[PDB]
Design an enzyme around this catalytic site. Sequence first.
Site, PDB file in Angstrom:
ATOM      1  N   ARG A  46      40.017  38.817  47.003  1.00 27.16           N
ATOM      2  CA  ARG A  46      40.038  37.378  47.068  1.00 27.16           C
ATOM      3  C   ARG A  46      40.295  36.876  48.499  1.00 27.16           C
ATOM      4  O   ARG A  46      39.721  35.864  48.901  1.00 27.16           O
ATOM      5  CB  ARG A  46      41.040  36.744  46.073  1.00 27.16           C
ATOM      6  CG  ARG A  46      40.735  35.257  45.826  1.00 27.16           C
ATOM      7  CD  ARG A  46      41.777  34.553  44.986  1.00 27.16           C
ATOM      8  NE  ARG A  46      41.220  33.286  44.501  1.00 27.16           N
ATOM      9  CZ  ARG A  46      41.855  32.119  44.519  1.00 27.16           C
ATOM     10  NH1 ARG A  46      43.082  32.008  45.020  1.00 27.16           N
ATOM     11  NH2 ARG A  46      41.253  31.049  44.049  1.00 27.16           N
ATOM     12  N   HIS A  50      37.909  34.191  50.310  1.00 22.82           N
ATOM     13  CA  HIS A  50      38.402  32.903  50.836  1.00 22.82           C
ATOM     14  C   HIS A  50      38.344  32.754  52.354  1.00 22.82           C
ATOM     15  O   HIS A  50      38.224  31.644  52.872  1.00 22.82           O
ATOM     16  CB  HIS A  50      39.793  32.598  50.300  1.00 22.82           C
ATOM     17  CG  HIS A  50      39.766  31.972  48.933  1.00 22.82           C
ATOM     18  ND1 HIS A  50      40.790  31.191  48.425  1.00 22.82           N
ATOM     19  CD2 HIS A  50      38.809  32.005  47.969  1.00 22.82           C
ATOM     20  CE1 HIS A  50      40.466  30.776  47.212  1.00 22.82           C
ATOM     21  NE2 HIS A  50      39.268  31.263  46.911  1.00 22.82           N
ATOM     22  N   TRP A 189      41.109  38.116  33.037  1.00 27.18           N
ATOM     23  CA  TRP A 189      39.778  37.866  32.466  1.00 27.18           C
ATOM     24  C   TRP A 189      39.327  39.005  31.539  1.00 27.18           C
ATOM     25  O   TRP A 189      38.333  38.862  30.784  1.00 27.18           O
ATOM     26  CB  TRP A 189      38.732  37.735  33.552  1.00 27.18           C
ATOM     27  CG  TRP A 189      38.747  36.474  34.354  1.00 27.18           C
ATOM     28  CD1 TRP A 189      38.062  35.306  34.079  1.00 27.18           C
ATOM     29  CD2 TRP A 189      39.399  36.267  35.629  1.00 27.18           C
ATOM     30  NE1 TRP A 189      38.289  34.382  35.080  1.00 27.18           N
ATOM     31  CE2 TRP A 189      39.091  34.950  36.045  1.00 27.18           C
ATOM     32  CE3 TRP A 189      40.217  37.064  36.446  1.00 27.18           C
ATOM     33  CZ2 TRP A 189      39.583  34.410  37.215  1.00 27.18           C
ATOM     34  CZ3 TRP A 189      40.715  36.513  37.642  1.00 27.18           C
ATOM     35  CH2 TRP A 189      40.390  35.201  38.006  1.00 27.18           C
TER      36      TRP A 189
END
Length: 292
Positions: A46, A50, A189
């Site tokens: 991540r 980002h 998830w």
Amino acid sequence: TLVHVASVEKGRSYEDFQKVYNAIALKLREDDEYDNYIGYGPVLVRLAWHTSGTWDKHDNTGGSYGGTYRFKKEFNDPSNAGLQNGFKFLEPIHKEFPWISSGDLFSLGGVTAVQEMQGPKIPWRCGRVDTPEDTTPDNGRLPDADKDADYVRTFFQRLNMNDREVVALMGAHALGKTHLKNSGYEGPWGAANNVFTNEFYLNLLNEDWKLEKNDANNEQWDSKSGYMMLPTDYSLIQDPKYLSIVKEYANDQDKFFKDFSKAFEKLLENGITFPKDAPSPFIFKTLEEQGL
Ligand code: HEM
């Protein structure tokens, strides 16, 4: 316009960057307790996304080249809440290898996490150069999660990604979890959240999703198994163009692997001009392939 030309860290070559990869990989293995034994894999992926995801194709502002997440304005973007854990992980790596630029370190962290989590090889190029504080992009360029397919599609046009590239990239949401304190969403998830697979697409399609509110008063899709999807995730099954592609990746692990690799390398390279005589992209060996 604004041009950013890749400049190889002086005298460095493949084996230098393999050593950095290895240091990152060895620490991923050793610090395995983080986030209830998920490990730092997902947050490093991540962080790579980002730090690249601020790019704007129209004026080449933001992007991975400058390594600007190191400055307080970007470090404190609400969209970046939680990423400080990934930055802290990488600090002793950068201390050991002070010659690597920040952009190269943030992006290589993501590549290393994907590969070490058994995902596809991600070819990687060096040569990002630190730029000054005043080149840090403003907050607000990373995406909102409470929106629909039209918002997702429009948002990613700014990163020069098409429908297939968007659906492939979103498969990284097999990894890790949402944390209420960070983003106002909660839950993983899927089951396999520190091993890289196409489980995101299988879950979108096969789980029985209910639209619920979490403890931060935001709507998210929940299943009986304890898994969640963001509204922006769920939009990939509401839009019939996204849906076709989701089904494709749910039924072909190799294709998802190949398309994700391409899209993620491209995300990490957006904004950067590679001289014609730049080195070829490096494909690093995993610890496992090196017998380490
Ligand atoms: C519409 C686009 C996207 C939205 C709205 C979005 C939103 C989010 C949110 C809200 C979280 C939870 C952060 C937290 O609470 O800790 C998250 C986590 C995460 N995202 Fe995204 N994301 C998007 C696209 C992507 C892409 C393109 C990637 C990489 C290719 C990615 C990789 C990840 C990973 C690995 C995590 C787990 C982090 C962890 O477990 O600490 N996401 N995403």
